[PDB]
Paper text:
Efficient egress by T. gondii critically relies on micronemal secretion of TgPLP1, a member of the membrane attack complex/perforin (MACPF) protein family. The domain arrangement for TgPLP1 includes a central MACPF domain that is flanked by an N-terminal domain (NTD) and a C-terminal domain (CTD). Both the NTD and CTD have membrane-binding activity, but only CTD is crucial for proper TgPLP1 function. The CTD includes the apicomplexan specific APCβ domain, which consists of 3 direct repeats with 4 highly conserved cysteines in each repeat and a C-terminal tail (CTT) that includes a basic patch.
Despite using a construct that encompassed the entire CTD, the resulting crystals contained only the APCβ domain. The TgPLP1 APCβ domain crystallized in the C121 space group with two monomers in the asymmetric unit. The structure was solved using iodine soaks and single-wavelength anomalous dispersion and subsequently refined to 1.13 Å resolution. The TgPLP1 APCβ structure shows that the β-rich repeat region is comprised of a single globular domain with internal pseudo threefold symmetry wherein each β-rich repeat forms a subdomain. Each of the three subdomains contains an internal antiparallel β-sheet and an outer β-hairpin. The inner and outer layers of each subdomain are held together, in part, by two disulfide bonds between the highly conserved cysteines. Subdomain 3 (S2C Fig blue), however, aligns less well with subdomain 1 (RMSD 3.207 Å) and subdomain 2 (RMSD 3.175 Å), with the majority of the alignment differences attributed to two loops that protrude from the “bottom” of subdomain 3. The longer of the two loops has hydrophobic character, and thus is termed the hydrophobic loop (colored cyan), whereas the shorter of the two loops has basic character, termed the basic loop (colored orange). Given the hydrophobic character of the loop at the bottom of the APCβ structure we reasoned that this loop has the potential to insert into the membrane upon binding. Thus, we conclude that the tryptophan located at the tip of the protruding hydrophobic loop is probably responsible for changes in the fluorescence spectra reported here.
Residue numbers in the entry: 820 to 1085
Write the structure that this text describes.
Amino acid sequence: GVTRNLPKQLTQATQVAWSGPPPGFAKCPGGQVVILGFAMHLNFKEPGTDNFRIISCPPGREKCDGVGTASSETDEGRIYILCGEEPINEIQQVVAESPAHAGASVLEASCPDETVVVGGFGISVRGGSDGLDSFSIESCTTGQTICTKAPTRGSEKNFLWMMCVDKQYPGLRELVNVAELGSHGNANKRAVNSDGNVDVKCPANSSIVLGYVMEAHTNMQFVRDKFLQCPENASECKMTGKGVDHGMLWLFDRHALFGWIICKTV
Ligand code: NA
Ligand code: NA
């Protein structure tokens, strides 16, 4: 492209966040193609860890196709893409996940030879109706050659997605990643669109390039609207919980508001 400057190129590209039954797909605006992105399959009700998956969105396509199958209503897809006129060929994406029953160890992923981290995030999870009690998110760190995610809070699976770039790419040093876990625990269906919040903040003197916020929920099929891109050049990205709870009798659905951004120096 005419601009060789990673903060500017990433800010000017269009973000798209899509929710629906998996695998699904998210489409770039007409005339644009994928630069980077991810597709998730998530299910925070059914047992086990097979229903958690992240894959990268390959560049240069008009859409990003998702992953996983719609076996129950509680299976959901969440797809995030950044679209522009052409790919940034210096970017390479990496995903990793732990095997079933190998979640007690630290997950590690490395950038391809001679590249370094632009950004990304890792998540740890557990299945079952209470499994969001073990949810965590950690950002990857710009300028490293690796990203890792460690188990915590009783989690049984780790997964991560990151973007890497040639080490000399202009402007890389101006970028910083932030991930946040906000309100989490039992959901409250009487807090009208006000069931806790997440507030992902840039460090002082930086503003948002891209990112997203999401409500994770036992019943993901009822919080599809709670998945949104983060606003360019804002100081923070915020979202409230919807206030949804399909638990029977005395049982509460669980939720977790979380997000991830890349910020750039102002
Ligand atoms: Na943008
Ligand atoms: Na579904």
